[PDB]
Structures are given as C-alpha cells and as structure tokens.
Coordinates of C-alpha atoms and ligand atoms in Angstrom, one line a residue:
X1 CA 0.0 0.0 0.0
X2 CA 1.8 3.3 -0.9
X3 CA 2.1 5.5 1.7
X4 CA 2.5 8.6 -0.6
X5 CA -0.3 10.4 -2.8
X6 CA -0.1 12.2 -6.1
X7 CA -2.4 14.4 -8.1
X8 CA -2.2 15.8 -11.7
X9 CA -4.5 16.8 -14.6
X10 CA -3.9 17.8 -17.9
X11 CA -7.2 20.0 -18.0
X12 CA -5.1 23.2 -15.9
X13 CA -3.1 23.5 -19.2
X14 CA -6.0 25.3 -20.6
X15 CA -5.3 29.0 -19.1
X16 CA -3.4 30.4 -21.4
X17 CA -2.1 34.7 -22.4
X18 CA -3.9 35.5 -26.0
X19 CA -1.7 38.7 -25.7
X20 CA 1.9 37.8 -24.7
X21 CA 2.9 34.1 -25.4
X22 CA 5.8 33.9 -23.5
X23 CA 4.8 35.4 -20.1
X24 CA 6.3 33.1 -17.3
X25 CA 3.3 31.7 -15.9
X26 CA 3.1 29.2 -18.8
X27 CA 0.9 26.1 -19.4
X28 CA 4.3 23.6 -19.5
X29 CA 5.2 24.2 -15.9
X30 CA 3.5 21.4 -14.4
X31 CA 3.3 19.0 -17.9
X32 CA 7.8 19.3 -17.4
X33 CA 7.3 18.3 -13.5
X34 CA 5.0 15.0 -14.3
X35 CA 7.5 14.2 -17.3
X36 CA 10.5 13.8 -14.7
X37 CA 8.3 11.9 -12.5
X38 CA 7.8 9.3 -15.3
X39 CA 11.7 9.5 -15.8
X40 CA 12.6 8.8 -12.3
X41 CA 10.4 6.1 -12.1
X42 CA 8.5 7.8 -9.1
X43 CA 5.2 7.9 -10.6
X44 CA 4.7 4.3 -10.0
X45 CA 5.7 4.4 -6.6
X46 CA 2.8 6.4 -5.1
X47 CA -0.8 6.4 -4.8
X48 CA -2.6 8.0 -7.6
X49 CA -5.7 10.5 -6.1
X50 CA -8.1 12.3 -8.7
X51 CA -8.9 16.3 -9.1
X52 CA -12.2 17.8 -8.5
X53 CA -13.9 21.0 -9.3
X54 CA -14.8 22.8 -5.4
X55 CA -17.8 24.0 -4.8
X56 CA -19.3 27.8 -4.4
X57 CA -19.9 27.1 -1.0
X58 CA -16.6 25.7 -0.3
X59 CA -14.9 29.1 -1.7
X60 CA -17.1 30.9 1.0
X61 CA -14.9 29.5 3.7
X62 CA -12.7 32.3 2.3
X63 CA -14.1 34.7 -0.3
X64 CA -16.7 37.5 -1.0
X65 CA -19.8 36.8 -2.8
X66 CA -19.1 39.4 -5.0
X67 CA -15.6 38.4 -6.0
X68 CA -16.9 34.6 -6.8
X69 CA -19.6 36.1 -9.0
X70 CA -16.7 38.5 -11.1
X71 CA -14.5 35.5 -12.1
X72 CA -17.0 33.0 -12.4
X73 CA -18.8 35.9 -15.4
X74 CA -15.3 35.5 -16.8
X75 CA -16.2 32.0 -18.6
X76 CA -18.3 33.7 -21.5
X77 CA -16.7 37.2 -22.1
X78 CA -15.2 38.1 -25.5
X79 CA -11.5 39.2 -26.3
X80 CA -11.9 42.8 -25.4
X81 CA -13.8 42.5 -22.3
X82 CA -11.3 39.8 -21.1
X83 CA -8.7 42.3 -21.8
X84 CA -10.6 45.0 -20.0
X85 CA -11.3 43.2 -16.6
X86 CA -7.5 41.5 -16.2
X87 CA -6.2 45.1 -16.4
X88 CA -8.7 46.0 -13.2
X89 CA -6.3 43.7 -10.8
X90 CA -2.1 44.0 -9.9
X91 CA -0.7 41.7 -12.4
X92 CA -3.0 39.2 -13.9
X93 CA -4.3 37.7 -17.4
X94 CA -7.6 35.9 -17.9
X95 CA -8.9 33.1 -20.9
X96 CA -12.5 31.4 -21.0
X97 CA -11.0 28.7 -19.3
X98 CA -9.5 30.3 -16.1
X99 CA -12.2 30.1 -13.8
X100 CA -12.5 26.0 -14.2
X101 CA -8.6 25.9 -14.0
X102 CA -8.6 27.2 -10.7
X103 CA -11.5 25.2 -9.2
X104 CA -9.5 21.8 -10.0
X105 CA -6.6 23.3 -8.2
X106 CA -8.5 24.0 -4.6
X107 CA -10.5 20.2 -5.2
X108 CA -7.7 18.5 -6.0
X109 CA -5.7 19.8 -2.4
X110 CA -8.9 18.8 -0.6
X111 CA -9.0 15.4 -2.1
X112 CA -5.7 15.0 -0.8
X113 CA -5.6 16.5 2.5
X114 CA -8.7 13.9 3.0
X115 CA -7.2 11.0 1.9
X116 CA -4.3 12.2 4.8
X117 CA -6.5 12.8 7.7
X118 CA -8.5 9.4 7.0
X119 CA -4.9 7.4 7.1
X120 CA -5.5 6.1 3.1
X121 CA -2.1 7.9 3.2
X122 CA 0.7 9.1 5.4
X123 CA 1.9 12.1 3.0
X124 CA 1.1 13.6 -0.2
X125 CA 2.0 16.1 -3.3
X126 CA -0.3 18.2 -5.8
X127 CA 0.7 19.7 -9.4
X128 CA -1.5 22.2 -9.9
X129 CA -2.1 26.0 -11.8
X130 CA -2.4 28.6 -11.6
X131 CA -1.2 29.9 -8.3
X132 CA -3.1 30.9 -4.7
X133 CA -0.7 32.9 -2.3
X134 CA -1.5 36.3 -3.2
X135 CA -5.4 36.4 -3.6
X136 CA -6.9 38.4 -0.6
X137 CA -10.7 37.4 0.5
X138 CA -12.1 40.8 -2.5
X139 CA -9.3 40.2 -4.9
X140 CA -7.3 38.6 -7.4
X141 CA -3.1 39.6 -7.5
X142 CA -0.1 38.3 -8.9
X143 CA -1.0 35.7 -11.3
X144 CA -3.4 34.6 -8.4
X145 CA -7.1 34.4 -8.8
X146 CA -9.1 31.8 -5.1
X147 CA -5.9 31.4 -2.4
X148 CA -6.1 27.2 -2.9
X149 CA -3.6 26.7 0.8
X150 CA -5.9 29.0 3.1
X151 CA -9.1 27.1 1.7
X152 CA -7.1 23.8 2.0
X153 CA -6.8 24.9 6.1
X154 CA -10.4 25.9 6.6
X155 CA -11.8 22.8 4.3
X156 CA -9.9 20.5 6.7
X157 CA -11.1 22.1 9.9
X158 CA -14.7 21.6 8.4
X159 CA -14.3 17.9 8.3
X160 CA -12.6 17.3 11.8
X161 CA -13.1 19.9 14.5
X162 CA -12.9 23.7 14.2
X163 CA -10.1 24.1 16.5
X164 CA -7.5 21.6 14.6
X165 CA -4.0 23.3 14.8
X166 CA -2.7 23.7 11.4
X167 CA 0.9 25.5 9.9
X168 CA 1.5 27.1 7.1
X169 CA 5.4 26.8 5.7
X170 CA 6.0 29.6 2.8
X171 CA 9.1 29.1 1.0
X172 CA 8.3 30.3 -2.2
X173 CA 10.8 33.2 -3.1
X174 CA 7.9 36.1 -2.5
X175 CA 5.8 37.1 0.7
X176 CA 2.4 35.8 0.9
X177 CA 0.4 38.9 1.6
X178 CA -3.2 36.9 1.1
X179 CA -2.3 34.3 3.8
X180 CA -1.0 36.7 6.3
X181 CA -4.0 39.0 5.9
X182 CA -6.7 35.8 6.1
X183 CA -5.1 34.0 8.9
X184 CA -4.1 37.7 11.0
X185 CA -6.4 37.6 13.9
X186 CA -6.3 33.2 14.1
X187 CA -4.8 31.4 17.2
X188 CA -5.3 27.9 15.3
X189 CA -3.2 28.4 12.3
X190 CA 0.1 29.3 12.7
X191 CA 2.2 31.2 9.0
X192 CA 5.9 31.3 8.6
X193 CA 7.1 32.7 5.5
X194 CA 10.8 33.2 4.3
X195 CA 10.8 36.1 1.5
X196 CA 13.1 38.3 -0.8
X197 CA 11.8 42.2 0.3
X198 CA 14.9 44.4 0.0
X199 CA 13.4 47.4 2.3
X200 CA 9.8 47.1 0.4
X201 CA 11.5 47.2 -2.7
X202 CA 10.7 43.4 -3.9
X203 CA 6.8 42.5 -5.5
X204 CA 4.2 42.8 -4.1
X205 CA 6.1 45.9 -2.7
X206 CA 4.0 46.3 0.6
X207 CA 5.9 46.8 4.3
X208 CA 3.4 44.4 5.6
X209 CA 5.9 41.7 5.1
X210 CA 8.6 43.3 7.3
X211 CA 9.6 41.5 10.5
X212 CA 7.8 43.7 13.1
X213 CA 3.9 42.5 11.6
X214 CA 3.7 39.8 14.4
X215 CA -0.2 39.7 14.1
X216 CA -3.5 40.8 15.8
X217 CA -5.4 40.7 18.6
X218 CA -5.2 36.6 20.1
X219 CA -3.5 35.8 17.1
X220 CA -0.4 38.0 18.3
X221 CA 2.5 35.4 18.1
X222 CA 0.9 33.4 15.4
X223 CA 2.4 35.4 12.2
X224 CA 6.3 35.2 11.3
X225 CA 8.2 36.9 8.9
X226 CA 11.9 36.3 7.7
X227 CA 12.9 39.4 4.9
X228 CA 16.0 39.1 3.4
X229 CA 17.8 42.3 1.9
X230 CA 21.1 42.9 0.7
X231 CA 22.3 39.3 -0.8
X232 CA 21.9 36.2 -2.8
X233 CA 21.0 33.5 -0.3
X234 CA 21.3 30.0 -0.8
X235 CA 21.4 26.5 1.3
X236 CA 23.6 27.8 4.4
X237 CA 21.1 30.9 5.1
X238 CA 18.4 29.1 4.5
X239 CA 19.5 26.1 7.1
X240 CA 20.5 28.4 9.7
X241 CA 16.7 29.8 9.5
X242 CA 15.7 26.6 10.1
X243 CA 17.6 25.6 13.2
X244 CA 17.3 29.0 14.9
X245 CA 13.5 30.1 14.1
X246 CA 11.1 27.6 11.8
X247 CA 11.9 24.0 13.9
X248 CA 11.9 25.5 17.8
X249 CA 8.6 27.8 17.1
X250 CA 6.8 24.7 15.2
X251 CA 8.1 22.5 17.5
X252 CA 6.2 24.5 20.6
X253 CA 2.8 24.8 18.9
X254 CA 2.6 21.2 17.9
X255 CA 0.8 21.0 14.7
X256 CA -1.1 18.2 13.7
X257 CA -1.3 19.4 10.2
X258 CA 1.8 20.8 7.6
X259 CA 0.7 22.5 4.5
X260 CA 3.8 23.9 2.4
X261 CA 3.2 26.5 0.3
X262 CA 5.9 25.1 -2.4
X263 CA 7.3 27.8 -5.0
X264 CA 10.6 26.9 -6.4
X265 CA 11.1 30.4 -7.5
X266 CA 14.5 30.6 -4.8
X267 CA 16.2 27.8 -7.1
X268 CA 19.5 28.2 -8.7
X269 CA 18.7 29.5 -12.3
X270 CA 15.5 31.3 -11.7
X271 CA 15.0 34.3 -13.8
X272 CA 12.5 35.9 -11.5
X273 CA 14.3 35.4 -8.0
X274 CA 18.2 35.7 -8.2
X275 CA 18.8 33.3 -5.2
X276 CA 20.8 30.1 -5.3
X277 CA 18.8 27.5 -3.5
X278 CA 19.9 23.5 -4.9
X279 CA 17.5 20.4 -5.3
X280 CA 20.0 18.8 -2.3
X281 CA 18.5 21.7 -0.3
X282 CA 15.0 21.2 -0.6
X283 CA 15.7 17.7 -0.2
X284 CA 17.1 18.6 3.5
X285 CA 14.1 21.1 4.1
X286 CA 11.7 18.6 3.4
X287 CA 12.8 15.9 5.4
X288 CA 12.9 18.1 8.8
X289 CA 9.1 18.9 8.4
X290 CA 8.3 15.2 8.4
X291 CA 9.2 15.3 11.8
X292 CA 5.7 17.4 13.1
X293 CA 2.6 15.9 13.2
X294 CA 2.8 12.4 13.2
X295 CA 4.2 13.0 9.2
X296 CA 0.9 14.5 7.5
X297 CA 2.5 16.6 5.2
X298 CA 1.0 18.1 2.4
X299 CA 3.4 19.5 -0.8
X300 CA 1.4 22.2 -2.9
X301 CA 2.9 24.4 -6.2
X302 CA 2.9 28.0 -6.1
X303 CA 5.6 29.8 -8.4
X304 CA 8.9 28.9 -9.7
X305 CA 10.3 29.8 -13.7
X306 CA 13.0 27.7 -15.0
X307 CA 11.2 24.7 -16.2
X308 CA 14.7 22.2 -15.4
X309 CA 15.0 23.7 -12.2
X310 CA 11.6 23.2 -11.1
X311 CA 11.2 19.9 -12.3
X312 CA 14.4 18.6 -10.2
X313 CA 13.9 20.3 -7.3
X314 CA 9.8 19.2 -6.5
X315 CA 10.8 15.4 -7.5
X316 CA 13.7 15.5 -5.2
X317 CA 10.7 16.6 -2.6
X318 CA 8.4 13.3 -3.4
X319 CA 11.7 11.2 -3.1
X320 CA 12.0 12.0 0.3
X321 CA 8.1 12.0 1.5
X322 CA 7.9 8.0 0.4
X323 CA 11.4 7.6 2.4
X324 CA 14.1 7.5 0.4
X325 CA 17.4 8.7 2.6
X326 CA 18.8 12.6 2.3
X327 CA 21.6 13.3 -0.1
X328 CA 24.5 15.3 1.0
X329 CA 25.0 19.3 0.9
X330 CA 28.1 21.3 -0.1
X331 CA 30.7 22.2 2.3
X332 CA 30.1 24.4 5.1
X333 CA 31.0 28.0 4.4
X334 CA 30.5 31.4 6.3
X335 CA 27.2 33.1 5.9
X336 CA 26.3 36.7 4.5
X337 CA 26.2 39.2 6.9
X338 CA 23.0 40.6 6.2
X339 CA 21.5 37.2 6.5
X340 CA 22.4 37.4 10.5
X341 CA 21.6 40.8 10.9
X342 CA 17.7 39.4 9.6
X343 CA 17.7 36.5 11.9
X344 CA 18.7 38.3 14.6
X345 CA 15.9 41.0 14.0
X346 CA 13.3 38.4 13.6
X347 CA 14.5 36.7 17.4
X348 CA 13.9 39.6 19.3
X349 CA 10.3 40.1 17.7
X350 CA 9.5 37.0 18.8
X351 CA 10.7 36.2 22.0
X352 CA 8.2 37.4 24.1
X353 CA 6.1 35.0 22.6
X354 CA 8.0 31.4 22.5
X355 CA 10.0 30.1 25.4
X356 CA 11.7 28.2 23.1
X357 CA 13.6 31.3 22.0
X358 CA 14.2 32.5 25.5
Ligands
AH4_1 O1 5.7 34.0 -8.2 C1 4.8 34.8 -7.9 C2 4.1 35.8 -8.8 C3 5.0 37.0 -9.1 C4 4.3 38.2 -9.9 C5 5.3 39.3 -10.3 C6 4.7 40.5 -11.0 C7 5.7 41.6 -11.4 N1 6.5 41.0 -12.6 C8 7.9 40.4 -12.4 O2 8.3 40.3 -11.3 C9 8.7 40.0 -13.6 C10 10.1 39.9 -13.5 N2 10.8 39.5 -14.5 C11 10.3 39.1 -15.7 N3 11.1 38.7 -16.8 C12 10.5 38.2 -18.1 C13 10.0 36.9 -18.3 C14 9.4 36.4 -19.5 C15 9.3 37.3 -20.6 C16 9.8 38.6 -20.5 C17 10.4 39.1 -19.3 C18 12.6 39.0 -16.8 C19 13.6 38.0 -16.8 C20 15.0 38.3 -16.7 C21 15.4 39.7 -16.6 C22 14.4 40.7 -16.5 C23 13.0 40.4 -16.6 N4 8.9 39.1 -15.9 C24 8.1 39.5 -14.8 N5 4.4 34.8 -6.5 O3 5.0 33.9 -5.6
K2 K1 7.4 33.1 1.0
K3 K1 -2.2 33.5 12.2
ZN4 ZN1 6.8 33.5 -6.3

C-alpha cells in the first residue's frame, strides 16, 4: 500500500495569455514536472488521487460573494472584455478557461488533504495551476485568482473539529500577503514565510511583510516573517533559519497538520528570483518537516520559472516523503552578513512570545 499520494491533470493546461505568449506563468510548468516523475520512475511508486472541481460554498470558507460572482462571469466574455477586466487587478491575465482551472486546483488539495486525515495515506504532493498565495478574501493579484492553501486549512477544519491546529510553511521566493491578511487575527493556524523584500523594494512591494507585523489581537504570536535584503541567499542561510526560528517555534505549537506553500522560485537559475537554493536543499528542508505531526505533510505548487530547475527540485521533494534517505550538501562556508543581521531581527520580535527562543 503506498504510503504517498499524487495528483495531476492535464485539464489546468487550458489558461493560457492571448496577448503575450511567453509570459512566465506558462501552461508547460507542471506538464515538465510529471514528465520527470515518469523519468525517475517515481510515478509508479505512489498512490494515484483524482482532481475535482470545489464547490461555491466551499470558496465561501474564504471569499466574498461578489468576488466569486466577477470570475466565475469570466467564462463567456469576448477578447476585449477579457482584456478590459485582467487590467482592473495588480498583475493578472484571464482566458474562457480560467475560472475551471482554478476550481481543480483547490479540489484536488482537498481530495488529498482527505485521503491524509483518513490514514489512506501518510503524506502527499499536488501539481496544480495557476497559483493561490497572493489572492486576498475581494481580490485577485499576482497571477493569483481563489488562495487554494488558506481554503485547503479551513476545508480541513470543516471535516474534523474547528479548532485543529494547522501551519503554514511559505518558502516560495515572495511574501504571501493573502495568507497573512486571512489568517491575522487566528490562534489555530500558525504562518511562517521566508521572502526576498529588499526594504519594500521586492513585488508585491508592501511593508506588511517586514519583521515587526507579528499579528493581531489573540493571534499575536501566530504570524512570522523572515525578509532578506542585501544578498543572494542559498542552502547555508536558509538552514540556519531553520535551526534557529522555523523548527523550535513549530516545534512549541505542535501541529497536527503541515501545509507547504511550495514555490521553487528561490532555485538556482530562476530568472525571476536571483537566489541560489539546490534540489539537495530542498531535499534537506523537506525531510525536517516530516518530523511534526505524526508526518501529515502536504506539498502544494505555487511559483517557480526555470522549467529544469523546477522539475528537479519538487521530484527530489516526493523522493524524500515515500522515504528514500537525504543526499548530501556542499561544504560548510561562512554566511552573509545581512542574513544574520535578519535573523537576529526576527529573534527579538518574537521572544516574548515562544519560550523556546528565550
Ligand atoms: O511568483 C509569484 C508571482 C510573481 C508576480 C510578479 C509581477 C511583477 N513582474 C515580475 O516580477 C517579472 C520579473 N521579470 C520578468 N522577466 C520576463 C519573463 C518572461 C518574458 C519577459 C520578461 C525578466 C527576466 C529576466 C530579466 C528581466 C526580466 N517578468 C516579470 N508569486 O509567488
Ligand atoms: K514566502
Ligand atoms: K495566524
Ligand atoms: Zn513567487
């Protein structure tokens, strides 16, 4: 019985740009990552789960009526009114097919986060487009239109008990500003994001994402930032965040649920990001969060560009969920000193908060 799931569909190839062919977002991005599956003989390894539409109740759990009804109008507009709306939001193109394209994505991650909770599986992956991290409860942003790991959270609650604790790991290279703003006044689900900001510099070009936004009301504690500025980090910044912040504050609010937020956009060759992250890396960061939660880890695609580097470094992810054993990293080597100066910032925002830190 395979102990890890996997879900894919052809169907989310169907958003497309009818004005720029070559914009980054493009329909091959997840088509390359279940090619090297095939390759690497992984496919046959796991436990193959279907996609779903969701429902227009289940987007409730997060969204306004009134947004739901705007992109779901989307499916019969012609060429110049699809043109028109797109250029209402920050950053975002829209086909006839874009509304069904993004209903598979959130029913496929709560097919799977089902099949964890029930124990049909231990751990599970899900290749799916377009993006979710930047679409706020009235809006689409950023290539973004329904925020598919917030709903995934709140969809799970709804089938246990309101007050399951849930985290939230965001490692894709830019700052989640959706998720935070959701989640900002919640003592049951605990976000951690690492981020490129550069001062406010960085997209989506908001101060909300500094260190100091430590959340509201009884969720105060239960939001954490980590902004980098002035370097191009790789594996040894990225470790040391782990060791000193991510592990001791997960390991104090004992999760019974991990949800990773999985851009590869911080890989080495990304023509977005800059940053030097390897698949060995991710490998390594992967294998630490199977540690919480009895294992029920769940791996979910947000961004990420280079379409070798992206499908390396999420197989290298799936190897390690159905327990193959950790490759090695480069040598050790001294970190940037802008990377301490951010860690240290972070530590004394949070210590009032976490013993562990203390
Ligand atoms: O991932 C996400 C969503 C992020 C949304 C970002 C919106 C602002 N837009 C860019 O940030 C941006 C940056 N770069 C580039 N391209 C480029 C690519 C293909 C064709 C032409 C140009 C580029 C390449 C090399 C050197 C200079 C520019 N395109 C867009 N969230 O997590
Ligand atoms: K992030
Ligand atoms: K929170
Ligand atoms: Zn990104």
């Amino acid at each position: 019985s395979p102990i890890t799931g996997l879900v894919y569909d052809q169907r989310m190839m169907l958003h497309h740009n009818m004005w720029d062919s070559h914009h980054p977002e493009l329909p091959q991005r997840i088509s390359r990552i279940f090619s090297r599956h095939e390759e690497l003989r992984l496919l046959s390894r796991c436990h193959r789960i279907p996609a779903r539409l969701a429902t227009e109740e289940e987007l409730a759990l997060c969204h306004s009526s009134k947004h739901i009804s705007i992109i779901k109008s989307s499916e019969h507009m012609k060429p110049r009114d699809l043109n028109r709306l797109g250029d209402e939001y920050n950053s975002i193109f829209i086909s006839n097919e874009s509304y069904t394209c993004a209903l598979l994505a959130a029913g496929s991650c709560f097919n799977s986060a089902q099949a964890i909770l029930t124990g049909q599986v231990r751990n599970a992956v899900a290749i799916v487009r377009p993006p979710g991290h930047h679409a706020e409860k009235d809006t689409a942003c950023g290539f973004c239109f329904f925020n598919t790991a917030a709903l995934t959270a709140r969809y799970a609650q709804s089938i246990t008990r309101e007050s399951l604790r849930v985290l939230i790991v965001d490692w894709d290279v830019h700052h989640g500003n959706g998720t935070q703003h959701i989640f900002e006044e919640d003592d049951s689900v605990l976000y951690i994001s690492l981020h490129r900001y550069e001062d406010g510099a960085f997209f989506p070009n908001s101060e909300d994402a500094n260190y100091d936004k430590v959340g509201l009301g009884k969720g105060r504690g239960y939001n954490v930032n980590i902004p980098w500025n002035g370097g191009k980090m790789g594996d040894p910044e990225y470790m040391a965040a782990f060791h000193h912040l991510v592990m001791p504050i997960a390991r104090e609010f004992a999760p019974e649920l991990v949800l990773v937020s999985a851009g590869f956009d911080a890989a080495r060759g990304d023509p977005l990001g800059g940053f030097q992250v390897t698949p060995e890396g991710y490998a390594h960061l992967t294998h630490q969060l199977m540690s919480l939660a009895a294992g029920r880890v769940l791996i979910i695609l947000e961004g990420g560009y280079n379409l070798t580097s992206i499908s390396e470094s999420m197989s290298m992810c799936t190897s390690m969920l159905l327990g193959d054993s950790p490759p090695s990293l480069d040598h050790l080597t001294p970190l940037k000193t802008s990377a301490t100066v951010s860690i240290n910032n972070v530590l004394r925002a949070h210590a009032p908060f976490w013993s562990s830190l203390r």
